[PDB]
């Protein structure tokens, strides 16, 4: 088994890239709050549109 | 919700954000701008109505 | 908030956790290493 393990390491590449893709996402979406809250702060403080 | 689906594409989702606070600074701008100013011109018919 | 009341990301979540361990647990891949292992060997995988 140890001789041949190239057959194996296209599961766990696929895996590996399968996870960085969800953490894009997740830190894509907190972004996304920090932006919100930020225009809200806007709003709150005074008026200015 | 649709930041984690699974074939969303982020732009899009970012793009939709943009458009949805800017209808809610919209809507609550219309409610308020209203409020005071229309209550000001009833106000004044207030003090009308207090001199009768 | 957004995701202590969420039940479509809990359910991925789980999807995802469970092919995971499908991966670890199977006859092919019984060589690996420990979850926490720090191999002081590789010197840029330490420094990572």
Known sequence: KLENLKDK??????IHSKLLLRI?????????????????????????? | ?????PDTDIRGVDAQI???????????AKFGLENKYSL?????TLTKELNH | VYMKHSNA???????????????????????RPTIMDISLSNTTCLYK
């Open chain 3, 9 to 31: 990301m809990k359910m991925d979540r789980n999807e995802f956790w469970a092919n995971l361990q499908n991966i670890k647990e199977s006859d092919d891949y019984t060589l």
């Open chain 2, 40 to 44: 000001k011109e009833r106000l004044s």
């Open chain 1, 9 to 14: 390491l296209p599961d766990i590449k696929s």
């Open chain 2, 1 to 5: 919700e649709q930041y984690c689906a």
């Open chain 2, 18 to 28: 943009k458009n949805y606070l800017d209808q809610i600074k919209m809507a609550r």
């Open chain 1, 24 to 49: 894009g996402k997740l830190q894509g979406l907190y972004d996304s709050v920090q932006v919100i809250n930020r225009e809200v702060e806007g709003l709150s403080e005074g008026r200015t549109s």
